[PDB]
């Protein structure tokens, strides 16, 4: 009975300078142990936010996270070329740790 | 739930976590993580045991808590409050 994570929007197109929000849903309450990762076209992955809203060292303020219970979201402001990537959420509440399918952002 | 096993013998205190058999066990002492690869080599964690060699009452008394890998210290709800002296012929 592992926790299923879902990101209903598989792909999103936006414009430079815009602000977008990516939704993430858990099948059970994950008590804010929700993290966000950014994967670049070359396959490199970086941590962005952990525990729903804490920014990881080196991550710019344009990234913010929110959510509670089963509903979470990542908000990315002032979009730039460097932000073109796939964003993934992951729950860290119960083993086995699980990830959603990601949202590919094109700008 | 089973109680923590508290073994005080000579100058060594050995605590044994109650449950979670088959799981890696982690520890905190007064809200500080211990049992890993830290500077103090008189503190050892093996299986469900935490060994405190040359135990110091002043620095090592206090709250101890164990939890299985996969769990969070913040969620632990069963603590050991240890106040012990390792005096010769304590009896």
């Amino acid at each position: 009975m592992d926790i299923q994570m879902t990101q209903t929007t598989s792909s999103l197109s936006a414009s430079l300078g815009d602000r977008v929000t990516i939704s993430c849903r858990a099948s059970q309450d994950i008590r804010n142990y929700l993290n966000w990762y950014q994967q670049k076209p070359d396959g490199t992955v970086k941590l962005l936010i952990y525990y729903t809203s804490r920014l990881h060292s080196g991550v710019p303020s344009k990234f913010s996270g929110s959510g509670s219970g089963t509903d979470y979201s990542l908000t990315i402001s002032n979009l730039e070329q460097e932000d073109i990537a796939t964003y993934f959420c992951q729950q860290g509440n119960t083993l086995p740790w699980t990830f959603a399918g990601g949202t590919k952002l094109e700008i | 739930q089973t109680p923590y096993k508290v073994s005080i013998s000579g100058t060594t205190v050995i605590l044994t976590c109650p449950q979670y058999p088959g799981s890696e066990i982690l520890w905190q002492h007064n809200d500080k993580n211990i049992g890993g690869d830290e500077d103090d080599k008189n503190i050892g964690s093996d299986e469900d045991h935490l060994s405190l060699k040359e135990f110091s009452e002043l620095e090592q008394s206090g709250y101890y808590v164990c939890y299985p890998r996969g769990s969070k210290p913040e969620d632990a709800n069963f603590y050991l409050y240890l106040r012990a002296r390792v005096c010769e012929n304590c009896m």
Partner: nanobody
């Protein structure tokens, strides 16, 4: 700087086994947990398991316990994952990723290797 450097791509036939590696630099190997993550179809991510480098004790996702064997070599700061009884369904990119040593931070991955592509075919 802090980095996880993984071994190169591997091509293997079904039924074979393959051990891939992950070299840590810029930080104390034994002061953090090492995790392995599988990405198939260039999207779907799955946490396979973790290993405590200091103690050499592993904890697996039941889905991959039969498929993987995790080990570490403390002397060289290298983590290994051996993949067993390979099938084409095991073709994917595998990542090693670091997390905290203790439960206060072992559940989010702060440093990721570049990934190792494994392709199983005949």
């Amino acid at each position: 700087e802090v980095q996880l450097q993984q071994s190169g791509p591997e091509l293997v036939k079904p039924g074979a086994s393959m051990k891939i590696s992950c070299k840590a630099s810029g930080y104390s190997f034994t002061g953090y947990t090492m995790n392995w993550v599988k990405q198939s179809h260039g999207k779907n991510l799955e946490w396979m398991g973790l290993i405590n480098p200091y103690k050499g004790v592993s904890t697996y996702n039941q889905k991959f316990k039969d498929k993987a064997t995790l080990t570490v070599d403390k002397s060289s700061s290298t983590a290994y994952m051996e993949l067993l009884s390979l099938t084409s369904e095991d073709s994917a990119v595998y990542y090693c990723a670091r997390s905290g040593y203790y439960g206060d931070s072992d559940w989010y991955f702060d440093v990721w290797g570049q990934g190792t592509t494994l392709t199983v075919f005949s």
